[PDB]
Design a protein around this ligand. Structure first.
Ligand code: NA
Length: 200
């Protein structure tokens, strides 16, 4: 087939843990003594706009946490949010290796502040050339438009690209715009499937 010219990488659940998923929020909420039902409902409402970069973290925190007096600060809270991010060593290592031979980019959903913390903390920029992130672009996976935008920014044809994501819905959406895609289950599996596409 066409030679692959670019890889697009999901970050959460692939390169790193998710930044602010259900399980993590549950944990952090407990630590801060938050009413979990109210917190979850408020997060549900506000999260998408944070993810799309149309509301600030301060704004989100105002609605989701600091809507009543608290015995801690937004800075305190933000610190603990940031700390939820941990590496996925084997996949990271694979990506770092491949980055020596291929042009690669992120295509991921994440609020700006957590995104930038994750990039700097884990040196994602050493192997990803650009970060096509929801909070920067104002669209989010699994919107077909996000995939198309990534392709447009990288200037590669759909068939010359491969999307790596842990969610089947995202893999399928990528394929629907003409991209190759592989669902990331584990490093060994991902390496083999990429190799099948000529990405070694
Ligand atoms: Na993911």
């Amino acid at each position: 087939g066409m030679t692959i010219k670019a890889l697009f990488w999901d970050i959460g659940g692939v390169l790193l843990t998710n930044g602010w998923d259900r399980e993590q929020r549950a944990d952090v909420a407990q630590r801060f003594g938050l009413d979990t039902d109210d917190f979850t409902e408020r997060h549900r409402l506000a999260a998408p706009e944070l993810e799309l970069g149309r509301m600030t973290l301060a704004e989100y925190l105002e609605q989701v946490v600091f809507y009543q007096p608290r015995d801690f600060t937004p800075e305190d809270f933000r610190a603990v949010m940031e700390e939820q991010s941990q590496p996925r060593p084997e996949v990271l290592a694979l990506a770092r290796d491949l980055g020596q031979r291929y042009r690669m980019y992120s295509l991921n959903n994440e609020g700006r502040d957590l995104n930038e913390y994750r990039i700097r903390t884990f040196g994602l920029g050493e192997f990803l050339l650009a970060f096509f992130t929801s909070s920067a672009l104002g669209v989010m996976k699994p919107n077909p438009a996000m995939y198309r935008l990534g392709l447009t920014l990288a200037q590669v044809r759909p068939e010359e690209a491969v999307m790596v994501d842990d969610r089947l819905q995202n893999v399928q959406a990528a394929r629907a715009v003409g991209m190759h895609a592989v669902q990331c289950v584990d490093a060994a599996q991902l390496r083999e499937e990429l190799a099948a596409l000529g990405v070694r």
